[PDB]
Design a protein around this ligand. Sequence first.
Ligand SMILES: CCC1=C(C)/C(=C/C2=NC(=C\c3[nH]c(/C=C4\NC(=O)[C@H](C)[C@H]4CC)c(C)c3CCC(=O)O)/C(CCC(=O)O)=C2C)NC1=O
Ligand SMILES: CCC1=C(C)/C(=C/C2=NC(=C\c3[nH]c(/C=C4\NC(=O)[C@H](C)[C@H]4CC)c(C)c3CCC(=O)O)/C(CCC(=O)O)=C2C)NC1=O
Ligand SMILES: CCC1=C(C)/C(=C/C2=NC(=C\c3[nH]c(/C=C4\NC(=O)[C@H](C)[C@H]4CC)c(C)c3CCC(=O)O)/C(CCC(=O)O)=C2C)NC1=O
Ligand SMILES: CCC1=C(C)/C(=C/C2=NC(=C\c3[nH]c(/C=C4\NC(=O)[C@H](C)[C@H]4CC)c(C)c3CCC(=O)O)/C(CCC(=O)O)=C2C)NC1=O
Ligand SMILES: CCC1=C(C)/C(=C/C2=NC(=C\c3[nH]c(/C=C4\NC(=O)[C@H](C)[C@H]4CC)c(C)c3CCC(=O)O)/C(CCC(=O)O)=C2C)NC1=O
Ligand SMILES: CCC1=C(C)/C(=C/C2=NC(=C\c3[nH]c(/C=C4\NC(=O)[C@H](C)[C@H]4CC)c(C)c3CCC(=O)O)/C(CCC(=O)O)=C2C)NC1=O
Ligand SMILES: CCC1=C(C)/C(=C/C2=NC(=C\c3[nH]c(/C=C4\NC(=O)[C@H](C)[C@H]4CC)c(C)c3CCC(=O)O)/C(CCC(=O)O)=C2C)NC1=O
Lengths: 162, 162, 162, 162, 172, 172
Amino acid sequence: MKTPLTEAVALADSQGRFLSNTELQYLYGRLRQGAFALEAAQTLTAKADTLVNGAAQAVYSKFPYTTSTPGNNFAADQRGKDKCARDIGYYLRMVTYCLVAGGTGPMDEYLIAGVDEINRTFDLSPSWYVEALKHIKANHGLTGDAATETNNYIDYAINALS
Amino acid sequence: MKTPLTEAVALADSQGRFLSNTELQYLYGRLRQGAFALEAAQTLTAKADTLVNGAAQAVYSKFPYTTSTPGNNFAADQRGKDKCARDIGYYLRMVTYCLVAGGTGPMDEYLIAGVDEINRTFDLSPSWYVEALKHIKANHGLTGDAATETNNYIDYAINALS
Amino acid sequence: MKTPLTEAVALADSQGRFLSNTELQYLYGRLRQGAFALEAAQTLTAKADTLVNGAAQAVYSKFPYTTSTPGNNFAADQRGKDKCARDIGYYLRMVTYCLVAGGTGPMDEYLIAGVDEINRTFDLSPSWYVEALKHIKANHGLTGDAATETNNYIDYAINALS
Amino acid sequence: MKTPLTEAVALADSQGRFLSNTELQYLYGRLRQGAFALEAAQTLTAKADTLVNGAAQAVYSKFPYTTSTPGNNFAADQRGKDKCARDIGYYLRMVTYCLVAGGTGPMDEYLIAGVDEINRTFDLSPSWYVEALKHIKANHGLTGDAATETNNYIDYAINALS
Amino acid sequence: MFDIFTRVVSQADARGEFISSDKLEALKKVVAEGTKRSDAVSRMTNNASSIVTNAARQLFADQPQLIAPGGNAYTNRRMAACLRDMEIILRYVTYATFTGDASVLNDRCLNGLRETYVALGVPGASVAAGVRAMGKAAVAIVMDPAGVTSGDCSSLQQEIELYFETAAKAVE
Amino acid sequence: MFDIFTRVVSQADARGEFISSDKLEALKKVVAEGTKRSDAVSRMTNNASSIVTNAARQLFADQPQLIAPGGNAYTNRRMAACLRDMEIILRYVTYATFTGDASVLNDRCLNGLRETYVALGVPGASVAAGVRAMGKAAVAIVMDPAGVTSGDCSSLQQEIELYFETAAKAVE
Ligand SMILES: CCC1=C(C)/C(=C/C2=NC(=C\c3[nH]c(/C=C4\NC(=O)[C@H](C)[C@H]4CC)c(C)c3CCC(=O)O)/C(CCC(=O)O)=C2C)NC1=O
Ligand SMILES: CCC1=C(C)/C(=C/C2=NC(=C\c3[nH]c(/C=C4\NC(=O)[C@H](C)[C@H]4CC)c(C)c3CCC(=O)O)/C(CCC(=O)O)=C2C)NC1=O
Ligand SMILES: CCC1=C(C)/C(=C/C2=NC(=C\c3[nH]c(/C=C4\NC(=O)[C@H](C)[C@H]4CC)c(C)c3CCC(=O)O)/C(CCC(=O)O)=C2C)NC1=O
Ligand SMILES: CCC1=C(C)/C(=C/C2=NC(=C\c3[nH]c(/C=C4\NC(=O)[C@H](C)[C@H]4CC)c(C)c3CCC(=O)O)/C(CCC(=O)O)=C2C)NC1=O
Ligand SMILES: CCC1=C(C)/C(=C/C2=NC(=C\c3[nH]c(/C=C4\NC(=O)[C@H](C)[C@H]4CC)c(C)c3CCC(=O)O)/C(CCC(=O)O)=C2C)NC1=O
Ligand SMILES: CCC1=C(C)/C(=C/C2=NC(=C\c3[nH]c(/C=C4\NC(=O)[C@H](C)[C@H]4CC)c(C)c3CCC(=O)O)/C(CCC(=O)O)=C2C)NC1=O
Ligand SMILES: CCC1=C(C)/C(=C/C2=NC(=C\c3[nH]c(/C=C4\NC(=O)[C@H](C)[C@H]4CC)c(C)c3CCC(=O)O)/C(CCC(=O)O)=C2C)NC1=O
């Protein structure tokens, strides 16, 4: 739960102090952010389906042993590729939620806290989702300020995975 | 020599007619194919050494026994490895010619005519080159019409090979 | 630092009481263990060099994309394979130390505590060392009780990695 | 059906002549062959179960991987072993028919017509049946004209097989 | 021989009038989905030979009397003849779904399939079951997209299903 | 926290005289079968991770809600925590068959677990199905023999089925 407003409330709350001018600035600085952020969330919602299909294409082209070698984790048959579409769709949707909230807290809460044990026990190499997020950040084609926000955004995703 | 221009010429030769508008549409289709086939052959020629190297390595890990037992088809010592890698490089070069020619003719004339016969008399197995081409079609990592046109050529070689 | 003797000392220190009758048995039970354990450590020291070479063979045959795809983590060139010989030699030596000490503490202290971040940041898929330890536990050919102790042993290694 | 009597009849049919003395000599040669070929087929039919059983076990020890990897041609489970032993029993029964017919006709019609084609479309390897026939021709243990006439039929099947 | 365009031409020539506007709208729909005809024909011609082996695989797991000696598919020559029959049957299915009209498959298989199969002694039941299983596998490989841009394909599914049932009631 | 040796001790103390001869035959045969018992425990904990993932993979194949959004184990840390709970239940049932008594199991982990899963909103029947499938694989791993002398572990197959059953029924 990291949005700038809840962190201002937590600071005032932890401190026990009443709301102040310092907290107030965040709200109209969340204007510099949000005035492009909601636009970028809508255009990502439009771009979404071709983004997951291209990311699945890039992951399969980078690592052919996934589509070749038979296994539960590997996408040899149909149902593995269905799991891949589910996983990359989850990643893109958490990027959209992270973009709308303004902070990494939805993404940090819904993805990052358990990804190390899941990648350890279920044999999911994180470099696959590295490929997927790099293909998304190359393919999304955001313009101006919104695009810059995503890079800081999607790089945080790769840094949590790597 | 499966070339849609030359196949159209051979057709109109067999009919004994002049050039019909069917052949004009045939030329249109050939230009439509080439308009991405040339760029696809370009990036394939860029990737070709890593492709044949990963394909040879993947076939060696795919069957450990060809590295293991001393035999004449198998790569016990390094000369067999050289001949094996020469064969997969030959395969990928035929794929590039097959792509740039617009049809299966370079593949047909240069591989498909007697491949199973030399595999019979040398006691090779075509499944080695099958899984090699599977690794190549997993490794080229392209998207679009060019990617699936190349993939169509590759699985044509797989189907005629097995 | 898990050997049965230091854990007996740690229990007696935490309770603040001198060793009881139960504590004494611990070491003559370390006789049921050690009377084969030192033999098995010596025969592993003899088996060691062919064990690492066969484990490198099995890892390269299981995953051909390591020997094919160029990268820093992958063993495409010589120096990557030298790093592989170093890593599997480290694993086998920690197995020998773990066998001589009697508990997992040397192995748990020298390998297990940082393996998750190293596999995360350096892109080392742990299924490679799964292959390596499974090939070692198949190839070591230990006799009787010594073999079983190692197996519980090597399964703990795979369970820490997976 | 390669039978020297019927081949003589087909020859005299193509000439349109009556029976010549060449055909009388042909009949003499057929009787000379049969005068030991029948007893050789008798002892082959006596030995046949041990022959196909030792041949299957020898091919299984000859290539361990067909027992090892799960595949559709290979004998991973016991049904593939049954189909494999059925195939070598079919081979030896064709050898007995080939012997008793005086020519390669039962072999030709019942095996040689499309053996390499079904080996191609099923991804079998003919070398398996080659080394099987080598074990059979090593195992029958006969002497005399009958032994080498059978051996001639066996290596004819080997040569046409490869 | 007969394409769906030439089908419309032959109807309009038998009537002898110009083509109706709504039929031309149907042809506009057809040329709108011609890329999906290309998608399907390319997909199943990619996997065609493996489909033939899997169809023979289910047929020979189903009816072991064919492999059994004295069976019609017993001998090596007849086995290659079987795979020849199934391969050219799937080939004419690909011809028909490329053209869009069943006239190619009808006029080059309906005539003598039943005839050869009763004249030789071929059991038409096995070929009918085999072309049914081959058609199910063909729909299975055509319909599911693997890295392919999404769309509806129910009309194509109906088309190749109709083509395989015409083959099945051709051989019976 | 009770070994079966100190079960006999505490029962004889609440009685208040010495341990009788019949309990001593029983304890001697306990000593003759505890060999089976202790390393039955460790071969159960040999494949404990693969047992845990196989039981969870079966559970989320049987109940697709728990990986569907809105389900209990949907988000990533809740799914990881569910894997943690299944590992904990397997580890404590492993402790219980090492002690030879279900007292460690009912004493250490099961008791407040029922109220914890009810107060969290966690389904209990899903856990019951998971521990039952996990127990089946658990005996069979121990039960199957690979590089071990043939022996009668029937009691072990017996008692570990009892321990997994008490775990699943106490989760409810
Ligand atoms: C909301 C955040 C979120 C994440 C990150 C997530 C990861 C995740 N991916 C899973 C499976 C999977 N994910 C993949 C995907 C891949 N594996 C590969 O080898 C491919 C390269 C890659 C495709 C890009 C596959 C194949 C499985 C199947 C594992 C199995 O079937 O046992 C599972 C197991 C759940 C199940 O059985 O369906 C989880 C929890 N789940 C989540 O809910
Ligand atoms: C343009 C298309 C084209 C291809 C593909 C081609 C292949 C080809 N591979 C050959 C042999 C061979 N091929 C192999 C290959 C292998 N053994 C192995 O370990 C590997 C699994 C496999 C690598 C693919 C070997 C070992 C030989 C020599 C056989 C022997 O040494 O007796 C030969 C026989 C002549 C010779 O090298 O010595 C031909 C003609 N020729 C062509 O014109
Ligand atoms: C004592 C316990 C111990 C462990 C476990 C250990 C792991 C370990 N492996 C490393 C590298 C490596 N380990 C490998 C080995 C492999 N990678 C692959 O792709 C192959 C499949 C596999 C061969 C089996 C390779 C290729 C590197 C090179 C990384 C680099 O050069 O950047 C490094 C980086 C150190 C260096 O740069 O030399 C560490 C710390 N080191 C230790 O000291
Ligand atoms: C009278 C002469 C005659 C012969 C010899 C003959 C062979 C023959 N073997 C076949 C298959 C087969 N052959 C094998 C054989 C093997 N895989 C192995 O592990 C062994 C190395 C090898 C034993 C030789 C297998 C496994 C199949 C089935 C292929 C698969 O299951 O898809 C088939 C395809 C039909 C079927 O069984 O299911 C034929 C026709 N037919 C004949 O009419
Ligand atoms: C272009 C359209 C076209 C078709 C379709 C066609 C079929 C055709 N199938 C034939 C045979 C055959 N077809 C089969 C079929 C089968 N085996 C069985 O037992 C099963 C019931 C079925 C397996 C699929 C067999 C065994 C033969 C050989 C019959 C014989 O040896 O007399 C023959 C006899 C010639 C030969 O020996 O090859 C023709 C002409 N011909 C054509 O011109
Ligand atoms: C042979 C080399 C080659 C291929 C592959 C080719 C494919 C091809 N399939 C296309 C469209 C399409 N193709 C499909 C077909 C399908 N999608 C599905 O979901 C079904 C599984 C499947 C039908 C069986 C659909 C739905 C579209 C887009 C909308 C439409 O036209 O219906 C398009 C139009 C734009 C595009 O999507 O790229 C092309 C170029 N052209 C070629 O030259
Ligand atoms: C020593 C014995 C002991 C047990 C058993 C125990 C259980 C336990 N399970 C918990 C959560 C959980 N338990 C599950 C359970 C499951 N997921 C499902 O969908 C199935 C119904 C079930 C798997 C069997 C889930 C999803 C959570 C996470 C709920 C949450 O943390 O929000 C929590 C809350 C803390 C947390 O992990 O976040 C505790 C304390 N604690 C203990 O100290």
